[PDB]
Design a protein around this ligand. Structure first.
Ligand SMILES: [Zn+2]
Ligand SMILES: [Zn+2]
Ligand SMILES: [Zn+2]
Ligand SMILES: [Zn+2]
Ligand SMILES: [Zn+2]
Ligand SMILES: [Zn+2]
Lengths: 223, 227, 221, 222, 223, 220
């Protein structure tokens, strides 16, 4: 397996939006690697979350950690420009949400960001065949985004995705989001995931550091 | 002073210009500085070319302790589903654009049945004719003096403010007249004199070095607005 | 200057397992017009019945005028099918058509009578330049597709009656939403001459008594 | 590893002026499932019948399984209504839902059986990660909503039956579009176990003879 | 009546697109004032006509006359930019086709172009009240656009339109389009129109100049 | 394969003298007049509609006209291009809710039908419509937005294999950054129908460029 170093990406949807900078500082001080950014436009999913200004506010506040913007929006091209200027690090989108996937991935790369494709539980991986050189991260949803129980079939899709990336020779992260907890993160990594989104499991816990410490402990006795 | 059927003046800062890294703190300062209403600009990247903040941020302000009335301006389309979320999130006012709903009456009724005050937002070009048959169901009328989601006060709004003020005055209903777009200390007197009683300002307050001084200066002009 | 009173029950409240039977009974009970509520799950959050049901009633023997209310968007394609299906009136919402005049003209060219439907909030302004092409004006007293009569509708009825009277043309003034025996008198006095009732008729045990009761209130005008 | 043969007449060809009577006759003539073609004027250029008609069939006494084929987009809201309306199967096209799994999960959580419908050109790959959530697979042998059996459907039937056979799950393989007595044997031999016919049954003078003829050819299939 | 000098604006949909430059030269040399450009995007109307490249092609060829682009498209803002760079003189659009009429009108003005609003046969004139300072032309459709006989009520709307312009004090052209010929141009002008779009009446005539002279002859026996 | 064919795209032609320019490119040896139709929705541009195809036929153009539809939805305008005299009509599968019916509409009109594949679009959708496609167009750039995407060669070879294994007569068309310096390799990948725009219509002499292209097509 030509994987990448493990990374924990809390989704700030579970964070305190009245004290966002403080809450992000606390989870990063607790050892988190990536700030995960769930953007919903009330159309691709039945919910509306936060826009590029929140990414801007985090950068102006001092957050230099990588910000991983997951676009659950459609169409994607215009708002991609705003997240590039707002300081996003990763920009990922669903292939179903863009009429021209290649041009959309190229738009992110030409902005200096790392680009990715997000796969709904039912979405097959076939669309990756002709954009392998243009995706830096692959996100598999283990729940239906925007609507809370881990879909077990995702483990098979994680293993298929890990195989596809390994045979490409390119450095591509395998990200997972949806029902990720301490009790299953060991099994999830064994399927081939190297980038882990957790939300409630971290931000709603009484101690962020122990939970992250518990996750990394399980991740070591996983591979 | 005057004979209009108005409501007591209210200053409604737009938290679009606030510090989203310290939002609860920033809202506390503007409220402690004399602001009345927290104005909430909700944009869904479809009705306007921008995406701002959803109901979870309104919930976060309520869970933090913000008890001031929260004025949710919906620049989204369609509106009914997200209207429910802002009701459950603790919004006080919910206003939306007539163009954004296929069924304006049902949408207004949805807000009222939540216990909220309802309103219609008017783009610079949108005429006021649609108010004729919903006068009993609007608690506030928001006049946009700029194109929402895109930056200079459009002067013709003063004429529409006067037209809106006249419709409310002759209606017998208690309806707030709100204005948003380029409202600052140098023009708030003329805007109030045109008939607005609810004033949304954004950068003028949140980008100022002292929030209380600016708000006092606004009230200074509002006092000399009906000579 | 009005048009003769007409009672137009909406078959949304009828028995779709015995539809021909129920329509015969309500018509034999004195109903004038069969009102047809078409919803496309887009313009309103519900899906009801399409032109094949209008077609099925015509093949069954129903010769009464069938009044097709389109709560759909866009409208031009399905207008054609309802022309071929044997519709008598075809009405649609001005917001649902990008080209109101062409859509009204499309109905007239099929031989049907055309109308525009106005949501509770919709002002009557759009009638100014199409008065020659509407045979019926339908005012919604409830939000279509979603149930209590909106009182402000009576004010719009009187404004609508004034516009029709000043046109000199034969245009029906229709009302739909919460119309019952207890209010049909005031609704007619406001200027309505065409009355859609649904639950009030089809859920009653005897159709003839309700319609006879309604005309009694229409008599005290 | 197929399922018991089932004949599912499509009531688009039935008499909607005497629908309860017409359905009783086809059911008394040996039909197994009432097939329900729902069109929203957007996903296909036609509008047929909504949940109230399914309700009317239940309120009239029809206890047979009602198989609702949703040719609509989006699907989630009307799915809820058909669950309450008393549907037995609810199927939809994968292209018509932005979130296929949540839509399938919606049907199952209502107590209904769920399925995916595939247009003549639509490939079967999308079933790979939803095999546990589909109870029926419907292949269209004509373009839905627009009348001759597309011959390539037999090959897709054989491919679909293999996928279901290799899954170990109880999933019906349904076919709809130009299915008649003269071709139902070959269709069944291709792997279908649920057969939608419309005009072939409801436009016939005796429903029982046509249905009887279909079962005769279904025997001389495999 | 604060009108503008009469202008004949033949619409090139009736022109020979195999010999467009030649045909435009002839109709202008025959006395036409404005080249009328009908843009349809197959969505706002059931037809697709010509885009900005044809406006560019006429300018690259030498056409210096004012080019009047009527946008029957929705949305309008993106293609407004392209018609500005392509060299349009007027850009007009339908208010129903823009979610933000004022911003769209301002976009045209900021490109250096003249702006306008187009009214379908049923569209009321009410929307002009708060954009009078931003419209240089008002186009009244006397037929349903994109689908051929003058709708008689348009004459009443012209008089209503002319009265609104007269009361504004602004230099605003009153344009008419749909079934305009020599036999009715006098009555149309007396109702208050000062800019006349004709298509087949001119381009299908054997001599373009004779028709234009006849139209200009009828315009004299107007007011 | 099919005999090599050069299909200049009239997006690069002179729309003020279109009949003349099309006459010149055909007299210079071009085989097919390529027609790029954009509706400002499927792609961020609006080009030319059926009236222009009709105008070319009324002018005398009897050559095959290849209409590539970058529009969505497609069925209504397919009807218009049939009336206008189109020879090929191709569309993107993502732009039609019912691909088979749309291909069938073209075939029932007497035209040849095809499917266009965006750079990211896989070829999987061809499996059940192989009997209904006369041409397969591979986009080597993002349509409507100009440099040849290298992965297209891999898809060309994969597509050529699918057609070769089908036994059906289907043209393999390529569009996007096709020039004299790369047309040999593209044909070697399996393409037999070549769309060029600027390379031909912006050249000072159309005949020399087309002659130069055919020379490279020979050493394939
Ligand atoms: Zn995410
Ligand atoms: Zn606002
Ligand atoms: Zn109705
Ligand atoms: Zn079916
Ligand atoms: Zn025009
Ligand atoms: Zn092309």
């Amino acid at each position: 397996h030509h994987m990448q170093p493990f990374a924990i990406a809390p989704s700030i949807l579970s964070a305190d939006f009245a004290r966002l900078g403080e809450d992000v500082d606390k989870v990063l001080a607790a050892g988190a690697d990536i700030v995960h950014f769930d953007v919903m436009d009330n159309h691709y999913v039945p919910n509306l979350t936060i826009g590029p200004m929140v990414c801007s506010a985090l950068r102006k506040y001092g957050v230099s950690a990588p910000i991983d913007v997951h676009l659950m929006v459609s169409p994607v091209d215009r708002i991609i420009g705003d997240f590039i200027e707002a300081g996003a690090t990763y920009i990922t989108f669903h292939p179903e949400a863009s009429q021209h996937i290649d041009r959309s991935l190229q738009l992110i790369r030409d902005g200096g960001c790392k680009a990715g494709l997000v796969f709904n539980p039912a979405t097959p991986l076939e669309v990756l065949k002709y954009v392998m050189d243009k995706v830096d991260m692959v996100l598999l949803m283990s729940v239906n985004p925007g609507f809370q129980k881990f879909i077990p079939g995702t483990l098979d899709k994680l293993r298929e995705a890990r195989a596809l990336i390994d045979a490409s020779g390119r450095e591509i992260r395998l990200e997972i989001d949806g029902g990720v907890n301490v009790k299953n993160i060991r099994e999830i990594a064994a399927a081939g995931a190297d980038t882990f989104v957790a939300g409630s499991a971290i931000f709603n816990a009484p101690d962020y550091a122990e939970v992250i410490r518990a996750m990394h402990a399980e991740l070591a006795q996983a591979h």
